[PDB]
Amino acid sequence: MDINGGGATLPQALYQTSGVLTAGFAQYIGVGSGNGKAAFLNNDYTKFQAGVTNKNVHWAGSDSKLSATELSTYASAKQPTWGKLIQVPSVGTSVAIPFNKSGSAAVDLSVQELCGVFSGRINTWDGISGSGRTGPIVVVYRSESSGTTELFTRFLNAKCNAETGNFAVTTTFGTSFSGGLPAGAVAATGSQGVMTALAAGDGRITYMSPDFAAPTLAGLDDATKVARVGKNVATNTQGVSPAAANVSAAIGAVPVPAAADRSNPDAWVPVFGPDNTAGVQPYPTSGYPILGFTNLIFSQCYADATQTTQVRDFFTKHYGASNNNDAAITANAFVPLPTAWKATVRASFLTASNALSIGNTNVCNGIGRPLLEH
């Protein structure tokens, strides 16, 4: 049986790029981070393929961090027989703001305008300064539990201090703003579903994986289709595009988890958030401001030896110093992890002697996620 993964749609085109997943891996199934987490945590393949129960779930992609409850429940229910779960960043990513409203003038949002658009305070194109555009704004958002929503609401939570209400960090955008959704907002499902909805009506705007926000990488720099963010009219400062190069420095500056915390899966996923707050990376002052990580969730242990080897071989490639996935990562509008980050991941999850290593012959002795489904 193949190793089965799925979840987050933000990186789905990356994981579906030929050669990114290695031998034994089934093609990645994009269903959203909420579904990905549920699939892994409950070993429930129906969260990947509705109506299909005959297979196990081996890993998930998620841009939503595992919650305290998700972690504690897995540790009590599954860890004794399946081993520790592993949660690790896969790549860095911007969050793009694509929109459907024609005009040669560049759409460049100040952070406060972004806040106003997504709170409903600014609901006309005239209300974005220098937009060259008029008429209603319709916000498109993710209907389901979405890691893109989590990455985006982390930014709104950190920055939107001047609304009639505030944004909570959440995976369901419909519940983020305490003052509710903007009138006329449209829900859609998946990264691609949202982009389809974006095109289905004039004047629509959304938040989006940079790999889906434009059909080509250069399209991310087209401010007639993908908004610049970071405008400051008073200081005559232009916003910038969500191209990977505009978040690469900020991603590169994120510290590896503290050694003493590495047995805690929560410690492995850096999150951005408010300024001057320990445990949280501040949003960058230069380049493009909206960014975060998308992550992998695996088991340390698989009952089956072949599955264990195949998982290790994937980690060897994805976190390899050489012969890795970095070119594909860049091609998909994402930021490769720094060399030192890759080394830290390998040291814990690959290097045999480490207590956290996949297939550790002592720690995983007689334990692991099951071969057969039942």
Judge if 100 and 128 occupy the same domain: yes
For 130, left (φ over 0), alpha (ψ -120 to 50), or beta? left
Judge if 277 and 258 occupy the same domain: yes
The token duo for 128 is 């974005």
- Structure resolution, Å: 1.4
Judge if 214 and 306 occupy the same domain: no
CB 243 within 8 A of CB 229: no
Judge if 252 and 316 occupy the same domain: yes
Sign of CA dihedral 115, 90, 64, 169: negative
Domain C-terminal end among 243, 266, 291: 243
How many C-beta neighbours within 10 Å does residue 295 have?
28
Domain C-terminal end among 219, 243, 267: 243
Residue type, 149: T
Residue with tokens 């085109």: 13
State the Cα–Cα distance between residues 356 and 143, nearest whole angstrom: 36
Judge if 261 and 300 occupy the same domain: yes
CA dihedral in degrees (316, 322, 324, 328; nearest 10)?
A: 170
What Cα–Cα distance (Å) separates residue 44 from each residue in 5, 41, 54, 313?
Answer: 11, 8, 10, 24
Per DSSP, helices labelled H in the chain are 12-15, 33-42, 68-77, 79-82, 111-119, 147-159, 190-199, 248-252, 305-318, 326-331, 339-349
What's the domain count of the chain? 2
Which residues, in sequence order, are CB contacts of 231 under 8 Å at separation 6+? 108, 109, 110, 113, 129, 130, 237, 238, 239
State the Cα–Cα distance between residues 217 and 219, nearest whole angstrom: 5
What Cα–Cα distance (Å) separates residue 153 from each residue in 176, 177, 305, 357?
Answer: 7, 9, 40, 33
Judge if 85 and 156 occupy the same domain: no
The token duo for 343 is 């080394």
Domain C-terminal end among 192, 227, 243: 243
Q: How far apart are the first and last CA of the chain?
A: 14
- Domain encompassing residue 122: 95-243
Work out the angle between the directed axes of helices 147-159 and 33-42 (0-180°, nearest 10): 120
In total, the chain counts a number of residues equal to 374
Judge if 160 and 22 occupy the same domain: no
State the Cα–Cα distance between residues 293 and 130, nearest whole angstrom: 32
Side-chain-facing half-sphere of 69: CA atoms under 13 Å: 2
Judge if 227 and 302 occupy the same domain: no
Residue type, 288: Y
Minimal CA–CA distance to 246: which of 215, 208, 285?
285
Residue type, 369: R
Relative to beta strand 291-299, strand 85-94 is: antiparallel
Q: Spell 214-236 as b/e; 16+ CB within 10 A means b.
A: beebebbbebbbbbbbbbeeeee
Minimal CA–CA distance to 81: which of 367, 299, 370, 374?
367
Sign of CA dihedral 211, 215, 217, 219: negative
**Burial tier of 311 (Cβ tally within 10 Å: 0-12, 13-18, 19+):** buried
> What CATH number does residue 356 fall under?
3.40.190.10
What residues are paired with 5 via a beta bridge?
A: 59
What SS3 state is found at 298? Answer: strand
Q: Distance from CA of residue 4 to its chain's centroid?
A: 19
Minimal CA–CA distance to 221: which of 98, 58, 352, 80?
98
Question: What angle (nearest 5°) sits at the alpha carbon of residue 83, between those of residues 364 and 311?
Answer: 70
For 216, left (φ over 0), alpha (ψ -120 to 50), or beta? beta
Q: Distance from CA of residue 40 to its chain's centroid?
A: 16
Judge if 338 and 283 occupy the same domain: yes
Relative to beta strand 85-94, strand 138-142 is: unpaired
Judge if 324 and 204 occupy the same domain: no
Judge if 318 and 220 occupy the same domain: no
Judge if 103 and 239 occupy the same domain: yes
